[PDB]
Amino acid sequence: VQLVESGGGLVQPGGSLRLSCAASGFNLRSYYMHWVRQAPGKGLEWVASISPYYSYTYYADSVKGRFTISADTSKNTAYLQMNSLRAEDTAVYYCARHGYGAMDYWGQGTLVTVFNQIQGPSVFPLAPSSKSTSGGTAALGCLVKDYWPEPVTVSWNSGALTSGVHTFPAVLQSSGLYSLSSVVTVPSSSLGTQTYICNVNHKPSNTKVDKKVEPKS
Amino acid sequence: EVQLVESGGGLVQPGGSLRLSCAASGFNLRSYYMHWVRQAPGKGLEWVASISPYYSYTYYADSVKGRFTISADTSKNTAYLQMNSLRAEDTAVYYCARHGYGAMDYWGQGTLVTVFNQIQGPSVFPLAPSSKSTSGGTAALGCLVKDYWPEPVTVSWNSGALTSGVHTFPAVLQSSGLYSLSSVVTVPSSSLGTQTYICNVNHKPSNTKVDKKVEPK
Amino acid sequence: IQMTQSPSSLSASVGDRVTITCRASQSVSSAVAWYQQKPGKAPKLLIYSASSLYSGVPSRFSGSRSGTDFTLTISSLQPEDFATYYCQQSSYSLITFGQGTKVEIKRTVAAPSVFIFPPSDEQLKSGTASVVCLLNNFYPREAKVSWYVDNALQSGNSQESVTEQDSKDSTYSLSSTLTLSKADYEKHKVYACEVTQGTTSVTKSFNRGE
Amino acid sequence: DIQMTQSPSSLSASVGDRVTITCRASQVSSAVAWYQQKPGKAPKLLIYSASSLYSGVPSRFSGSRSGTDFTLTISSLQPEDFATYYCQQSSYSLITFGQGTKVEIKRTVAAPSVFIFPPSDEQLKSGTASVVCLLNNFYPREAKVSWYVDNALQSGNSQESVTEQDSKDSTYSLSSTLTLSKADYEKHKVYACEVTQGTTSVTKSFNRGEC
Ligand SMILES: [Cl-]
Ligand SMILES: [Cl-]
Ligand SMILES: [Cl-]
Ligand SMILES: [Cl-]
Ligand SMILES: [Cl-]
Ligand SMILES: [Cl-]
Ligand SMILES: [Cl-]
Ligand SMILES: [Cl-]
Ligand code: NA
Ligand code: NA
Ligand code: NA
Ligand code: NA
Ligand code: NA
Ligand code: NA
Ligand code: NA
Ligand code: NA
Ligand code: NA
Ligand code: NA
Ligand code: NA
Ligand code: NA
Ligand code: NA
Ligand code: NA
Numbered sequence: 001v002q003l004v005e006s007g008g009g010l011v012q013p014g015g016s017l018r019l020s021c022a023a024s025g026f027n028l029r030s031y032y033m034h035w036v037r038q039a040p041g042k043g044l045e046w047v048a049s050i051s052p053y054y055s056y057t058y059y060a061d062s063v064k065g066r067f068t069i070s071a072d073t074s075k076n077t078a079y080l081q082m083n084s085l086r087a088e089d090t091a092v093y094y095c096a097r098h099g100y101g102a103m104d105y106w107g108q109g110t111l112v113t114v115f116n117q118i119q120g121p122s123v124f125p126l127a128p129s130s131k132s133t134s135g136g137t138a139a140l141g142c143l144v145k146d147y148w149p150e151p152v153t154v155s156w157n158s159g160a161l162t163s164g165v166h167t168f169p170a171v172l173q174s175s176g177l178y179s180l181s182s183v184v185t186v187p188s189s190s191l192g193t194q195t196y197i198c199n200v201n202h203k204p205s206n207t208k209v210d211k212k213v214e215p216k217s
Numbered sequence: 218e219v220q221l222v223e224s225g226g227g228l229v230q231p232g233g234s235l236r237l238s239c240a241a242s243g244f245n246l247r248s249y250y251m252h253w254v255r256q257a258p259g260k261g262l263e264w265v266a267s268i269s270p271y272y273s274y275t276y277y278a279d280s281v282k283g284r285f286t287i288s289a290d291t292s293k294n295t296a297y298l299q300m301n302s303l304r305a306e307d308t309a310v311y312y313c314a315r316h317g318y319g320a321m322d323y324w325g326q327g328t329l330v331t332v333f334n335q336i337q338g339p340s341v342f343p344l345a346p347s348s349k350s351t352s353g354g355t356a357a358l359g360c361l362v363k364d365y366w367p368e369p370v371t372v373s374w375n376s377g378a379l380t381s382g383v384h385t386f387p388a389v390l391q392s393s394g395l396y397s398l399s400s401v402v403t404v405p406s407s408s409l410g411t412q413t414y415i416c417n418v419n420h421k422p423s424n425t426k427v428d429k430k431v432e433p434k
Numbered sequence: 435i436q437m438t439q440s441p442s443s444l445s446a447s448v449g450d451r452v453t454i455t456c457r458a459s460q461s462v463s464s465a466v467a468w469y470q471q472k473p474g475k476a477p478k479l480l481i482y483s484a485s486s487l488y489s490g491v492p493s494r495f496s497g498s499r500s501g502t503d504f505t506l507t508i509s510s511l512q513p514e515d516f517a518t519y520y521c522q523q524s525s526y527s528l529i530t531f532g533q534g535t536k537v538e539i540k541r542t543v544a545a546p547s548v549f550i551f552p553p554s555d556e557q558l559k560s561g562t563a564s565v566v567c568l569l570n571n572f573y574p575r576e577a578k579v580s581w582y583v584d585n586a587l588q589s590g591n592s593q594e595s596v597t598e599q600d601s602k603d604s605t606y607s608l609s610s611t612l613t614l615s616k617a618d619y620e621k622h623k624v625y626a627c628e629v630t631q632g633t634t635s636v637t638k639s640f641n642r643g644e
Numbered sequence: 645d646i647q648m649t650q651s652p653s654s655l656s657a658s659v660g661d662r663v664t665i666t667c668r669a670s671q672v673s674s675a676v677a678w679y680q681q682k683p684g685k686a687p688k689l690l691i692y693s694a695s696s697l698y699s700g701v702p703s704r705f706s707g708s709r710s711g712t713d714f715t716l717t718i719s720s721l722q723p724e725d726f727a728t729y730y731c732q733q734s735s736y737s738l739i740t741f742g743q744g745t746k747v748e749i750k751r752t753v754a755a756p757s758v759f760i761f762p763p764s765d766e767q768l769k770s771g772t773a774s775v776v777c778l779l780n781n782f783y784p785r786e787a788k789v790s791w792y793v794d795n796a797l798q799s800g801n802s803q804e805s806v807t808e809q810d811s812k813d814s815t816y817s818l819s820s821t822l823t824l825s826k827a828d829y830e831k832h833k834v835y836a837c838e839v840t841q842g843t844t845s846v847t848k849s850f851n852r853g854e855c
Contacts, residue, residue, distance in 0.1 A: 009421075009422060010336070010367060010422060032527065034529065036529075036531075041800065043518075043520070043531060043532075043533050043534045044469075044471075044477065044520055044522075044531040044534070045531065046528075046529040046530065046531065049527050049528075049529070051527060056527070058527040058528060062771070094476055096476075098524075100482065101465075101467060101479075101482025101483045101486060101488075102467035102469075102479055102482040102483075102522060102524060103467070103469075103477075103479065103522070103529075104479050104482075104488070106476035106477060106478075107476065108476060109476060111368070111369060113367050113368065115334070115367070116333070118228065122767075122770070124763075124764045124766050124767045124774070125764050125766065126761045126764075126776055127761070127764060129855070131855065134757060134759065137757065139757075139759040139761075139778055139780065141761075141776075141778075143764075143767075143774055143776060143821075145767075145774065149228060149331050149333065150329070150331065151329060166780070166807050166817040168805035168806070168807060168817075168819050169805050169806070169807075170805075171803045171804075171805055171821070173803070173823075179774075179821070180805065181776055181805075181819050181821070183778055183780075183817075183819070185757075185780060203227075204227060204228060250737075252739070254741075259590060261728075261730065261741060261742075261743045261744045262679075262681075262687065262730050262732075262741040262744070263741065264739035264740065264741060267737055267739070269737070274737070276737040276738060279645075280561070312686055314686075317689075318689075318692045318693075318696070318698070319675055319677065319692050319693055319734065320677035320689055320692040320732060320734070321677070321679075321687075321689060321732070322689050322692075322698070324686035324687060324688075325686065326685075326686055327686060340557075340560075342553075342554045342556055342557045342564075343554050343556070344551045344554075344566055345551070345554060352547060352549065355547070357547075357549040357551075357568055357570065359551070359566075359568075361551075361554075361557070361564055361566060361611075363557075363564065384570070384597050384607040386595040386596070386597060386607070386609050387595050387596070387597075388595075389593045389594075389595050389611070391593070391613075397593075397611070398595065399566060399595075399609055399611070401568055401570075401607075401609075403547075403570060436827075436831060438831070440796070441796070442796060442797075442799070443799070533828075586651070586652070586653060589653070589654065617647065618743075621647060621649065621670075
């Protein structure tokens with residue numbers, strides 16, 4: 001028994017790619033077949049399964065509606081058609097056979113790499129607690145996540161707020177996208193009366209984001 | 218009153234072209250030498266090109282000669298850096314500056330130019346064992362597998378015949394976006410004269426294989 | 435269905451008894467399997483249905499379940515048992531995996547063998563110089579590698595890489611690469627790599643052109 | 645060609661100290677200038693012709709020549725003198741820069757204020773959770789930030805970032821972001837950020853879903 005995956009490689013976000021799983025020494029229509037992926041340096045994640053002869057399909061929540069597992073018995077081959085590819089789909093994709101107790105035979109895996117495209121950031125609040133747990137000084141900020149390429153710039157209150165601001169250098173995440181945070185310290189007594197808005201400009205994607213940062217209950 | 222403003226920087230493909238402009242105010246651009254100076258992220262200043270008053274003579278750093286062209290339009294009060302066959306090492310903030318008092322007295326704020334990644338086979342250099350062992354009879358040799366994109370590469374030695382004592386390290390991501398790794402092996406020094414050591418680097422994304430005979434220096 | 439693996443990693447000596455725990459949320463079923471994954475390889479099945487040992491797997495591996503906990507035991511840890519171990523739960527065609535447990539072998543200290551490689555003549559005709567420092571077959575992994583050029587300490591121009599633990603002697607190897615322009619390489623003379631571990635520092639060096 | 649060799653590549657000195665940056669020519673002319681570059685800004689010209697002070701530059705900056713050696717002196721280091729300094733050499737229209745010298749200000753130890761930020765409700769609807777730990781206004785930069793989730797030590801799922809030294813008080817700030825699956829975040833309870841510096845460790849924590 002041998003399982004051999006092909007078709008992995010470079011792919012554009014939003015693009016499509018189809019993997020094949022070539023089986024030998026057994027007819028795969030008589031077995032549940034699975035796709036399991038492994039992001040670089042991370043753990044195993046089950047992706048999809050196909051049932052024997054009934055061809056019933058099951059999908060993990062992260063890929064359903066984008067991925068489709070199928071099989072062609074005449075070629076003794078299993079397929080994973082992946083469609084709305086995104087940064088989180090970079091992984092080694094294994095097909096494996098379910099026999100008796102669990103997944104007993106595995107292929108060697110096929111690597112899929114989703115490369116980067118121009119993309120404006122998502123900007124989430126770093127919200128101050130209405131209750132100061134730091135003796136009267138509150139920390140707030142904006143988390144600027146998943147943009148490409150550099151750079152972004154951040155201002156607070158359209159330039160009105162400069163004292164106590166720290167906009168960090170961006171970090172390169174594993175997915176190839178950048179992320180940074182910008183923070184400011186203010187008096188807690190100001191949380192009820194002063195509006196704090198971060199303005200993020202990302203010229204490569206022609207995007208600007210304004211985020212009002214409000215205290216959490 | 219003197220103001221320098223660079224535009225036209227941004228994302229660019231390796232082998233592609235991009236044109237920067239340097240818009241001048243508060244002085245006539247024909248009466249001064251103009252310079253373009255770049256700075257790679259986190260690194261130091263590097264002079265790139267200069268343009269002469271009225272003779273429009275051009276001078277170039279060796280690293281850009283034949284690829285970059287500085288020019289000037291006196292009617293628009295603007296200086297230009299035309300950049301061709303861009304390469305990963307051209308990623309930098311480009312600053313134009315005015316020649317005042319023998320040096321660069323007014324600078325623009327700079328414009329970021331980012332060369333993104335393209336499929337590329339590695340350059341594979343020898344890690345050569347010294348003919349004279351300085352480690353008590355054991356020699357270390359290897360291959361430096363540099364500047365390929367994307368992952369992965371695989372390495373064998375002597376077409377798989379040499380496996381014991383091999384360490385092929387995980388690839389590192391360089392600042393330029395390209396990957397780099399080394400594969401090394403320890404052998405007896407007495408073997409350096411008679412035994413041939415070839416590393417075989419396969420890079421499937423670029424359909425490239427490199428075989429490098431590593432010889433003692 | 436959710437599986438929670440503990441610990442995320444551990445270090446134990448050869449011969450030690452090791453126990454990985456995996457906690458299901460809704461599992462009245464024995465449908466829990468254990469896999470072993472070695473670097474760069476697909477996982478291998480060890481235990482299935484929580485306690486059945488798969489064919490060919492050594493006898494020191496066994497599985498059990500206590501309440502909502504499923505447990506994998508390696509009764510006498512062997513060096514070739516370096517791996518990441520995964521519990522798995524199989525449902526009405528739905529599968530979940532634990533986050534895994536990395537098992538590293540504790541061995542006796544081994545000082546590294548340190549080699550230093552000048553840039554090759556071939557590489558220098560392209561205008562860049564990489565100097566490579568090799569630490570071969572050492573333990574533990576923790577080490578501090580510094581570069582000096584003409585006795586000046588380098589910052590921001592080197593990158594490290596480390597192998598996974600060796601399946602036979604349980605050591606690591608590590609590379610540090612200094613990257614410089616041809617011009618900077620050609621104007622300085624003494625290149626050294628300093629390897630510090632505990633109360634001992636070892637410096638391997640060369641003089642350009644010698 | 646002409647080459648400038650700058651020493652040191654970096655240094656740290658106290659306020660009021662005298663700082664001496666040396667730049668050594670390869671072959672030359674007094675066509676040597678000195679620049680100061682602050683983070684995110686173009687270099688500012690300080691000295692030209694090796695010793696002529698540029699207009700408006702404070703008098704504590706001065707330049708000197710002796711043979712092939714050129715020297716920049718800051719006679720009384722001020723906190724706003726944190727910058728990278730560059731010598732420059734001009735030839736028959738050919739220009740070379742030294743590699744620069746980063747000057748960092750030595751100041752008194754300051755323990756950071758440590759804050760911890762749970763992932764926002766907005767982000768969790770995308771399936772990812774970022775926990776953010778802020779070390780505000782501290783000195784020295786060297787610090788060890790570890791993450792714990794339900795008292796288990798985290799590895800390989802966090803990244804740090806550090807500001808440049810502050811131009812007035814000379815401190816640093818540092819962020820550490822732990823990134824988790826929404827599922828993993830919503831199944832654990834205690835999230836803690838441990839900041840170790842010297843003989844002191846400070847742990848800021850929160851319980852998910854509580855305050
Ligand atoms: Cl708004
Ligand atoms: Cl031979
Ligand atoms: Cl050592
Ligand atoms: Cl800068
Ligand atoms: Cl303090
Ligand atoms: Cl502290
Ligand atoms: Cl972890
Ligand atoms: Cl976790
Ligand atoms: Na990606
Ligand atoms: Na930035
Ligand atoms: Na950041
Ligand atoms: Na921007
Ligand atoms: Na030996
Ligand atoms: Na690789
Ligand atoms: Na042992
Ligand atoms: Na150097
Ligand atoms: Na030495
Ligand atoms: Na220099
Ligand atoms: Na700038
Ligand atoms: Na703790
Ligand atoms: Na992170
Ligand atoms: Na302590």
